[PDB]
Amino acid sequence: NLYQFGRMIWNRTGKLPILSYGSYGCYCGWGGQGPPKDATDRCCLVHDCCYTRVGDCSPKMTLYSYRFENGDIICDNKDPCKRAVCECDREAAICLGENVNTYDKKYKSYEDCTEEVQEC
């Protein structure tokens, strides 16, 4: 579910999940189109594409099992659905943490999201 994803993002980036990424770039908020404004934004793109492939399961509500192991986030689910959903949030969380350095709050105020549907 979104709460767990939120926890992850906070652990990796150290920022309040929704008020720093809730409306960032063209893909972090809800929906999404146009070119990624930046690395962080690109992270949110990939996550979106990740969610589409995970149709069967309910990406935003699916409760999965995840644990920390020496700092690392590990998805330990036997259910292919809950596991896949977990990996989608894990990946995103780590991608946002590796680009927190180029995070610019100006991307939640200024956005140029064209009509082109990106590559998944």
Ligand SMILES: [Ca+2]
């Ligand atoms: Ca989105």
